[PDB]
Design a binder for this molecule. Structure first.
Ligand SMILES: CCCCCCCCCCCCCCCCCC(=O)OC[C@H](COP(=O)([O-])OCC(O)COP(=O)([O-])OC[C@@H](COC(=O)CCCCCCCCCCCCCCCCC)OC(=O)CCCCCCCCCCCCCCCCC)OC(=O)CCCCCCCCCCCCCCCCC
Ligand SMILES: CCCCCCCCCCCCCCCCCC(=O)OC[C@H](COP(=O)([O-])OCC(O)COP(=O)([O-])OC[C@@H](COC(=O)CCCCCCCCCCCCCCCCC)OC(=O)CCCCCCCCCCCCCCCCC)OC(=O)CCCCCCCCCCCCCCCCC
Ligand SMILES: CCCCCCCCCCCCCCCCCC(=O)OC[C@H](COP(=O)([O-])OCC(O)COP(=O)([O-])OC[C@@H](COC(=O)CCCCCCCCCCCCCCCCC)OC(=O)CCCCCCCCCCCCCCCCC)OC(=O)CCCCCCCCCCCCCCCCC
Ligand SMILES: CCCCCCCCCCCCCCCCCC(=O)OC[C@H](COP(=O)([O-])OCC(O)COP(=O)([O-])OC[C@@H](COC(=O)CCCCCCCCCCCCCCCCC)OC(=O)CCCCCCCCCCCCCCCCC)OC(=O)CCCCCCCCCCCCCCCCC
Ligand code: HEA
Ligand code: HEA
Ligand SMILES: CCCCCCCC/C=C\CCCCCCCC(=O)OC[C@H](COP(=O)(O)OCCN)OC(=O)CCCCCCC/C=C\CCCCCCCC
Ligand SMILES: CCCCCCCC/C=C\CCCCCCCC(=O)OC[C@H](COP(=O)(O)OCCN)OC(=O)CCCCCCC/C=C\CCCCCCCC
Ligand code: CUA
Ligand SMILES: [O-][O-]
Ligand SMILES: [Cu+2]
Ligand SMILES: [K+]
Ligand SMILES: [Mg+2]
Ligand SMILES: [Zn+2]
Ligand SMILES: [Zn+2]
Lengths: 99, 180, 65, 123, 459, 49, 107, 47, 65, 121, 91
């Protein structure tokens, strides 16, 4: 549990997002400007920060392929060698051959 | 609350199927005799005489609307002079309760918001490039396989036997070389 | 005129005679019959029955009915 | 503003009605398509004809790569075939006791002749 | 008046009305087909009346293509909104617009009358010779209907092209969709007329083009030189509708408008040069096959760009707006369904795959997913969007989640199994089949009866 | 960025069919070589009825 | 690509410290099928329909200007249902440019 | 050889010629690409 | 159209064209097919049955039939 | 992260719970949802939180069910489909505890991988 | 069915007076829709279709039992030889 909190606090500190490098030409907000809008505005989707998104998405990818390996090695089985192919007698006549 | 109960009174349930009495009880096909309603039937629908038999577009009841001075009647605006200025008061439509019925209260709030636009020109341009060239790559990935399999069907092979197959209505004839 | 403002004013103002709707549905019904009636007629013409009995063109068991 | 049928349906939760309606419509369709074939018993679905086809498949070694690939897949993991569990024809509801006795006698006679030919071939 | 009206909006209503009427006959024929195919045996058609089945499939195809979907998506919605989108008072050619709808009705009456009076035989909707030219008079009547329909299509195309001369606003994507379909008609129809005249010459004028020393494969070239442009003349108006619905309902400006427009232009040019993918099994030269296979796969590029531009239109839209409207659901369903149809089209485009899948029910399911599902739903979605403007009522469709769900589920029950039987394999244009294909055929048949029942609930 | 999740989900599901195809080809190579289902000098002509 | 109108920081500076974003409802109201009175005849039901047009509605802001019902396409600008003759006065598509001529001004 | 009941046979079945094997494998080769094209596009059909 | 799905053959039997199709059967058996071009009333009733036998068996068959 | 790093002029809620609230709702009744996360009658406004007092840009969120039933409601106060829940509560939790988020995502992906591989194989 | 009152992760945020407003409940209620029998029938209905969609109805099995025992005997006695697990399948 001590190690759990340690790694949890280590991940958290590293992932805290930095301000975005805006790829758009917007003004600077006037200084001292607080909340102007309200919560009845059309909801804006809550998006993970890039670092966090990579971490969880990477955990998902490592998870699905490790799950694929677990199924392949434990749940599934390999083909045993094919049965020996011995000479066998074919039927004497085709069932539809006129007599 | 139930908004239907607010305008229940206006909606009186009907008596006749399809809202008309039998033609015998009242002849709705005839033109109304009421003054000023010569273009309407008794039930209120437009009469065939007005719309078909004597349609004005066909030259019946010729009456040019425009006057000598090239003018037609036009209704003016509601003008209200005030504060040393002539103002026009616009016509506001009646309350939607009058026209639709529901009482205009407890309306959900939909705020003003400017159009939802995609930003970051550079990012958008790259996506559009991918929207076009990712399919192009896939097509190119199929192109080589397509050529090979086509070449395979049309390969000059050292065939040693021939079977001729003719299709007729409705059976298949087969011609084969007979052993010597 | 106000009555002429809207195309198909009687229908849009919900005063039209219901017979117009009935004719439209009847016309569609007649159109459908052009696929069923010739089927029955052609079946009888070449077989003597208006419709077949399922699998009556194949060998059937003695107790088949 | 709506007739009784829609007022009734639209009152219920969508995911209560929708699933029931989906099954109901499908069941009705099958019922409609079964009314014209009540008691129809084609001879080719009898046990005698079913056995004769198996004999033909053995002689012709039919679909050998489907049989090999099924065995390989089943050995590796969970393999489920619809053909194994479900009927292949719709007349199964009426053909529980149906038989073609003429085919039974002919098939038995041919099998007896085949046994004689096999012994002769063995020599 | 009723028949004399020249109003472009009234004529648009007439086109939709007539498409539904003629559509009843189309659906009935489809029910006959699926009923017959429910098991092996004869079910509703006698073995001595097998010619009727051949006629049923032929008329089904012809009516649904030329008398239902084309009059509905290229005649109905276009004649009602195009002059409004162009901020013009009315259509450029009023009298021509009137005669076009009358022509369609008259050609329909000729076709159905030929069912009743003539001997019932069929040669497919593709009227391949020599089979088409050794038939009875019903084939002659069908040819007259097609030629008459061709007159209406070309004059309507001329009508829409004239909007460029009068348009007072901006050419929106939808307007571009109709204009390009009109161009495709002006260039493809004259070739069709020529080959149809040659079919008539052999039927009625003792010509010898389709007898030995004359190449029957010639017909297939000229027919399909119109055939495939036809499938895009039927889909492009649907694409135009989808663009309007998604932008309007999501309150989002079309993204990549110029790429949408240039994608439509590209599809048309490419669609005019890929026709021989319908003739892969005839025995064409290796290089020809490779050319056509290569160019056929290219069409996916412009078609793919449009699909992804639609997706981003729906992405990001406000959550507060109710998304259960039937028009929005149908528009979204079109993207989901069209991708299935197109991908299977790319599969069949590979000629070697096509050898196995030509003249099999895989082809059926492919073009049904695009037309019977995609095009129909697009026309429904477009009409639904214009319900207030058109003004029709007495139906429960606008907000009916049951109808959309049941339609989607059951339509897939019909045609998804037809992809499976394509690899079993079950040929097309047949009524009897081996007993080991009953399961899938039965499932699809159960789907057909169910879809019809759902059409009654709208009223 | 989300569209990438779809690419990865479509790459995982596609890879499942790649593995099935891979095993299919291995099985096919062993049919004519070892499979007892493969029989030769077995089918005899039926003859005209 | 369009990314909204450009804003200068000077234009984002309030004239009072209490200014917030105006909370005006842009939901026009509660509606349903247009409900005609039985007493009204064909002419008076036409007037009723013309008075129930959503595209004639607007929202008035705090300064007296009104934001109208707007649409991407002119299909939503005609009366619903569409009348026989719609655009008698040609709809005007307003384009903007920076060109000017002296005659328009006075000193 | 012959159709069998309730069989998907996705891409073909029971080849008996080298060309027949080619056809089956061509379909199998493209099938995962088709799944990718579908899944990748459908996942983004949402608000 | 001569179609044998197991042999990977689907060639259109068109009047005026004698199309060449090359094949190499690898296993014995009986491969069933059907006409794959609507050819008239009985398009569904002209199947294609090909039986592949050992070369020694084929020679004996050809010599007798 | 729109309120956290991109835009500083929208009200920022407090997370009441990183799990949805399950409630039975009735058609024809209007419900008011807390958008600040400080109400003591979650998921509803209690008359004493920021939303009730219209303070700091917080307002109650109107909601009305079409049919009767049990519906999930947002506790994180940031779900895209708020007041209803769509999974944003878990997403917002991962932003706040990225190490935990990875554990759950790996486990979910592991199960999905095993089942899909086991059935297809 | 008189559902229970689930306080949640933060019990202090559910400690107020709800009055008429509904109280939070356990998640089992959401899955059972408050143990609505019709939703349970609908749930069972959903499984029934999905089973038909993927594997077939499997409701015909009791009726097909005798005709699946005849098919199995024919395949074993007269059909082409099956090897190993292949013997489990009959077509
Ligand atoms: C135990 C043993 C083993 C131990 C193992 C141990 C392993 C340890 C691993 C540790 C790893 C640590 C990683 C840390 C995170 C690094 C990444 C990150 O988040 O940035 C860090 C850092 C984040 O800092 P922060 O603190 O979060 O600050 C955030 C700030 O607010 C502002 O920051 P900013 O303004 O600087 O901008 C940053 C932001 C800017 O973001 C953006 O602008 C958006 C980026 C995403 C755009 C995606 C567009 C996709 C369009 C698709 C269109 C077509 C669709 C249809 C296709 C149909 C096909 C049929 O970046 C992101 O959001 C990046 C998100 C993640 C991108 C992932 C791309 C994966 C591609 C995978 C391809 C796979 C191919 C497989 C082929 C297989 C073949 C068989 O970023 C920076 O500061 C900038 C520099 C770093 C940039 C990194 C590279 C980005 C690349 C984007 C590529 C997009 C896809 C392109 C191809 C598309 C093909 C279709
Ligand atoms: C695909 C299906 C499902 C679709 C589902 C999705 C749908 C989504 C929504 C789509 C919406 C599309 C847009 C809609 C716009 C509507 C606009 C509108 O209302 O315009 C106003 C327009 C006219 O209204 P108006 O302005 O008041 O017009 C006044 C008149 O102009 C003047 O009034 P008048 O009273 O003076 O009128 C003259 C009247 C005078 O009428 C009378 O005097 C009638 C007397 C009673 C006759 C009743 C029939 C008798 C039949 C006897 C049969 C006997 C058989 C015996 C057999 C014996 C066997 C042994 O008629 C005539 O004289 C001529 C009538 C010609 C038409 C009828 C033809 C019937 C078939 C004939 C077949 C002949 C075959 C011969 C073969 C020969 C072979 C040798 O409305 C209509 O025409 C009705 C439209 C109704 C439906 C509208 C759409 C509703 C939504 C869709 C519902 C579902 C429909 C599904 C299709 C149908 C299924 C069956
Ligand atoms: C050099 C030597 C020369 C020698 C020369 C010798 C002489 C040569 C003569 C040569 C020419 C002969 C022909 C002369 C034609 C004259 C036309 C003309 O100027 O008329 C003015 C005349 C004006 O009439 P009016 O005197 O002012 O009075 C009009 C009325 O009072 C009321 O006004 P209205 O205009 O409203 O009246 C018409 C209206 C009255 O009814 C309504 O208002 C109808 C309201 C809607 C009811 C529901 C209709 C069903 C839904 C239809 C949806 C699709 C609509 C498509 C577009 C419209 C199609 C009409 O509708 C109808 O009566 C027919 C409606 C048919 C609707 C479509 C039915 C499709 C069924 C599919 C199954 O036109 C008409 O009103 C009637 C024209 C009728 C033409 C009929 C052509 C039928 C062809 C059928 C196929 C033929 C081949 C196979 C036949 C097999 C038989 C067993
Ligand atoms: C840890 C969980 C995952 C475990 C497994 C992972 C495996 C590795 C994947 C790669 C790594 C991913 C790591 C992601 C970490 C989280 C990243 C992140 O940003 O998190 C927050 C982010 C969202 O957070 P937020 O923004 O706060 O909002 C929270 C909401 O939950 C908003 O949530 P949302 O909107 O993102 O919800 C996800 C939803 C979003 O998407 C949708 O909901 C779209 C649904 C559209 C359905 C349309 C109807 C389709 C009907 C078709 C019927 C056809 C019938 C006829 C067929 C005929 C064939 C002949 O996804 C789906 O519904 C899955 C669609 C899957 C593809 C569907 C098509 C499959 C086709 C298969 C082959 C078919 C072959 C035959 C057909 C023809 C082929 C040519 O979470 C995610 O991105 C979660 C993604 C989860 C994906 C799960 C997929 C499961 C099913 C797989 C199959
Ligand atoms: C409107 C109807 C319509 C539409 C749009 C199409 C579209 C396409 N069709 Fe068509 N087709 C028909 C209707 C249609 N078809 C009909 C009716 C027939 C049979 C006529 C008869 O024989 O009687 C037919 C027959 C037909 C055949 C004949 C098969 C045979 O005869 O055996 C072929 C093969 O080339 C084909 C191919 C295509 C292709 C390659 C497309 C392309 O347009 C598909 C493009 C779309 C996509 C590819 C999906 C969307 C794009 C993406 C998702 C981008 C990513 C994808 C890739 C990179 C591949 N079609
Ligand atoms: C766009 C044209 C179209 C449409 C809608 C359909 C719809 C349907 N088709 Fe289609 N069909 C074809 C065009 C179409 N078909 C063609 C061109 C062929 C090949 C012809 C040939 O082989 O020669 C064909 C072949 C064909 C066959 C092959 C028969 C054969 O040749 O062996 C079968 C049955 O399996 C079939 C079934 C169906 C079914 C069950 C429906 C539908 O019933 C499915 C259910 C959907 C609905 C019932 C809704 C339809 C509603 C409308 C169309 C009206 C829309 C109007 C408005 C919205 C105003 N069709
Ligand atoms: C096979 C034979 C096919 C024969 C087809 C002949 C018609 C081809 C098309 C001709 C051109 C049509 C066209 O657009 O011409 C417009 C012009 C009319 O324009 P208005 O509608 O009056 O518009 C007024 C604008 N101020 O067309 C005509 O004058 C057409 C006159 C002849 C009728 C042609 C159409 C009907 C078919 C006739 C077949 C005989
Ligand atoms: C509008 C766009 C019109 C484009 C018309 C030209 C497209 C040509 C595509 C290339 C096709 C090709 O390879 O041509 C061969 C191909 C025939 O090939 P085989 O039957 O194998 O015969 C070859 C020798 N034995 O050519 C054709 O069929 C082309 C038919 C003529 C089209 C002319 C259209 C003119 C329109 C104006
Ligand atoms: Cu011969 Cu079909
Ligand atoms: O036809 O594609
Ligand atoms: Cu084509
Ligand atoms: K049959
Ligand atoms: Mg063919
Ligand atoms: Zn609050
Ligand atoms: Zn939440």
């Amino acid at each position: 549990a001590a190690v759990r909190s340690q790694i949890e606090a280590a991940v958290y500190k590293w992932t805290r997002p930095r301000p975005p490098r805006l790829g758009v030409a917007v003004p600077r907000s006037p200084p001292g400007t607080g909340i102007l809008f309200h919560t009845n505005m059309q909801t804006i989707r809550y998006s993970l920060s890039p670092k966090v998104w990579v971490l969880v998405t990477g955990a998902a990818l490592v998870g699905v392929f490790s799950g694929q390996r677990f199924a392949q090695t434990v749940l599934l089985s390999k083909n045993p060698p094919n049965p020996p192919r011995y000479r066998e007698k074919p039927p004497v006549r085709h069932p539809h051959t006129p007599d | 609350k139930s908004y239907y109960d607010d305008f229940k009174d206006r909606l009186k349930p009907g008596k006749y199927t399809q809202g008309r009495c039998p033609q015998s009880e009242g002849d709705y096909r005839q033109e109304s005799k009421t003054i000023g309603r010569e273009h309407l039937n008794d039930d209120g629908t437009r009469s065939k005489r007005y719309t078909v038999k004597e349609a004005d577009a066909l030259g019946y009841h010729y009456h040019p609307p425009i006057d000598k001075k090239g003018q037609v009647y036009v209704k003016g605006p509601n003008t209200v002079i005030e504060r040393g200025q002539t103002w026009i008061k616009g016509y506001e439509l009646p309350s939607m309760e009058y026209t639709y019925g529901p009482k205009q209260e407890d309306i959900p709030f939909y705020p003003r918001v400017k159009l939802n636009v995609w930003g970051n020109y550079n990012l958008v341009m790259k996506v559009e490039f991918l929207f076009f060239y990712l399919p192009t790559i896939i097509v190119f990935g199929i192109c080589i396989p397509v050529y090979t399999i086509n070449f395979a069907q049309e390969e000059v092979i050292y065939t040693t036997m021939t079977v001729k197959v003719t299709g007729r209505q409705w059976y298949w004839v087969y011609e084969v070389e007979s052993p010597t | 005129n106000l009555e002429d403002h809207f195309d198909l004013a009687e229908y849009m103002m919900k005063m039209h005679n219901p017979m117009s709707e009935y004719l439209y549905w009847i016309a569609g019904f007649v159109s459908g019959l052009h696929g069923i009636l010739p089927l029955l007629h052609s079946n009888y013409y070449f077989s003597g029955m208006f419709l077949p009995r399922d699998n009556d063109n194949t060998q059937l068991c003695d107790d088949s009915w | 503003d709506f007739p009784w049928r829609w007022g009734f349906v639209a009152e219920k939760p969508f995911w209560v009605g929708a699933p029931i309606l989906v099954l109901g419509v499908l069941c009705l369709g099958h019922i409609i398509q079964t009314m014209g074939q009540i008691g129809v018993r084609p001879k080719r679905y009898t046990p005698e004809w079913v056995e004769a086809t198996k004999e033909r498949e053995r002689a012709e070694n039919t679909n050998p790569i489907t049989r090999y690939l099924d065995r390989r897949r089943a050995e590796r993991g969970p393999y489920y075939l619809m053909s194994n569990v479900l009927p292949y024809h719709p007349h199964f509801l009426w053909m529980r006791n149906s038989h073609d006795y003429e085919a039974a006698e002919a098939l038995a006679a041919r099998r007896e002749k085949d046994r004689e030919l096999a012994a002769k071939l063995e020599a | 008046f009723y028949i004399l009206v020249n109003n472009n909006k009234r004529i648009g209503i007439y086109y939709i009305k007539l498409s539904i009427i003629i559509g009843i006959l189309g659906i009935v024929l489809s029910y006959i087909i699926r009923v017959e195919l429910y098991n092996s045996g004869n079910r509703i058609i006698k073995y001595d009346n097998v010619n009727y089945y051949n006629m049923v499939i032929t008329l089904h195809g012809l009516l649904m293509i030329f008398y239902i979907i084309m009059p509905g998506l290229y005649g109905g919605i276009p004649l009602y909104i195009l002059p409004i989108l162009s901020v013009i008072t009315d259509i450029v050619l009023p009298r021509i617009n009137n005669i076009s709808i009358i022509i369609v009705l008259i050609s329909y009456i000729v076709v159905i009358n030929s069912i009743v009076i003539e001997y019932n035989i069929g040669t497919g909707w593709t009227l391949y010779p020599p089979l088409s030219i050794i038939g009875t008079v019903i084939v002659n009547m069908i040819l007259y209907g097609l030629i008459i329909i061709g007159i209406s299509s070309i004059i309507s195309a001329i009508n829409f092209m004239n909007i460029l001369i009068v348009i007072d606003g901006i050419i929106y994507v939808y307007i571009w969709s109709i204009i390009i379909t009109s161009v495709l008609l002006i260039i493809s129809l004259p070739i069709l007329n020529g080959i149809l005249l040659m079919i008539l010459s052999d039927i009625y004028f003792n010509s010898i083009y389709f007898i030995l020393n004359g190449d029957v494969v010639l017909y297939q070239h000229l027919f399909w030189y119109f055939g495939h442009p036809e499938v895009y003349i039927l889909i492009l108006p649907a694409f135009g509708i989808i663009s309007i619905i998604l932008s309007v309902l999501n309150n989002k400006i079309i993204f990549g408008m110029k790429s949408m427009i240039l994608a439509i232009i590209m599809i048309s040019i490419l669609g005019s040069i890929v026709w021989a993918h319908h003739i892969y099994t005839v025995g064409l030269e290796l290089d020809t096959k490779i050319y056509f296979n290569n160019l056929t796969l290219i069409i996916s590029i412009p078609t793919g760009n449009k699909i992804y531009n639609w997706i981003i239109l729906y992405i990001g839209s406000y959550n507060i707006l109710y998304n259960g409207y039937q028009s929005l659901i149908f528009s979204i369903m079109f993207i989901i369904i069209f991708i299935i149809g197109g991908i299977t089209g790319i599969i069949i485009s590979i000629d070697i795959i096509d050898i196995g899948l030509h003249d099999t029910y895989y082809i059926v399911s492919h073009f049904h997913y695009i037309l019977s599902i995609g095009a129909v739903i697009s026309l429904l979605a477009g009409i639904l969007l214009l319900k207030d403007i058109i003004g029709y009522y007495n139906v429960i469709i606008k907000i009916n989640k049951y109808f959309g769900l049941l339609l989607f589920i059951n339509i897939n029950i019909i045609f998804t199994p037809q992809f499976i039987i394509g690899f079993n394999v079950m040929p097309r244009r047949i009524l009897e089949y081996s007993d080991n294909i009953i399961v899938w055929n039965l499932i699809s048949s159960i789907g057909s009866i169910s879809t019809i029942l759902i059409l009654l609930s709208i009223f | 960025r989300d569209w990438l999740i779809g690419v990865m989900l479509g790459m995982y599901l596609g890879n499942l069919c790649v593995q099935q195809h891979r095993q299919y080809r291995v099985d096919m190579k062993l049919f004519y070589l070892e499979a007892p289902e493969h029989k030769i000098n077995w089918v005899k002509p039926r003859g005209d009825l | 690509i369009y990314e909204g109108q450009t804003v200068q920081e000077s234009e984002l500076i309030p004239q009072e410290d209490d200014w917030v974003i105006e909370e005006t409802n842009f939901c026009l109201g509660r509606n349903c099928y247009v409900r005609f009175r039985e007493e009204d005849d064909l002419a008076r039901r036409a007037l009723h329909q013309m008075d129930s047009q959503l595209n004639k509605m607007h929202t008035r802001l705090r300064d007296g200007t009104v934001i109208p019902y707007m649409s991407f396409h002119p299909d939503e600008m005609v009366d619903r249902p569409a009348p026989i003759h719609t655009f008698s006065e040609k709809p005007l598509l307003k384009w903007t440019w920076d060109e000017t001529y002296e005659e328009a001004y006075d000193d | 050889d012959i159709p069998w009941p309730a069989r998907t046979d996705w891409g073909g079945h029971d080849p008996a010629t080298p060309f027949a094997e080619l056809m089956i494998n061509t379909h199998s080769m493209f099938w995962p690409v088709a799944i990718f094209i579908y899944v990748s596009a459908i996942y983004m059909v949402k608000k | 159209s001569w179609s044998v799905p197991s042999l990977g053959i689907k060639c259109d039997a068109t009047p005026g064209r004698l199309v060449k199709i090359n094949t190499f059967i690898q296993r014995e058996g009986v491969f069933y097919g059907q006409c794959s071009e609507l050819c008239g009333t009985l398009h569904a009733f002209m199947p294609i049955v090909v039986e592949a036998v050992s070369p020694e068996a084929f020679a004996a068959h050809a010599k007798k039939w | 992260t729109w309120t956290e790093i991109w835009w500083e002029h929208d009200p920022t809620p407090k997370v009441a719970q990183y799990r949805p609230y399950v409630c039975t709702v009735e058609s024809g009744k209007v419900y008011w949802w807390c958008a600040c996360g400080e109400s003591k009658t979650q998921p509803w406004v209690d008359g004493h939180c920021k939303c009730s007092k219209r303070e700091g840009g917080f307002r109650p969120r109107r909601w009305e069910p079409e049919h009767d039933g049990v519906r999930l409601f947002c506790g994180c106060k940031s779900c895209f489909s708020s007041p209803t829940w769509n999974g944003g509560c878990f997403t917002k939790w991962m932003q706040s505890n990225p190490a935990g988020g990875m554990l759950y995502c790996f486990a979910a992906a592991f199960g999905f991988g095993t089942l899909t591989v086991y059935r297809k194989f | 069915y008189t559902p229970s009152f689930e306080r949640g992760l933060n019990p202090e945020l559910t400690s107020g007076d709800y009055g008429d407003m509904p109280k939070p409940q356990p998640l089992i209620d959401f899955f059972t829709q408050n143990r609505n029998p019709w939703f349970g029938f609908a749930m069972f209905c959903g499984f029934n279709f999905l089973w038909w969609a993927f594997f077939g109805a499997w409701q015909i099995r009791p009726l097909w039992a005798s005709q699946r025992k005849s098919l199995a005997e024919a395949d074993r006695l007269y059909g082409p030889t099956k090897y190993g697990v292949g013997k489990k399948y009959i077509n």
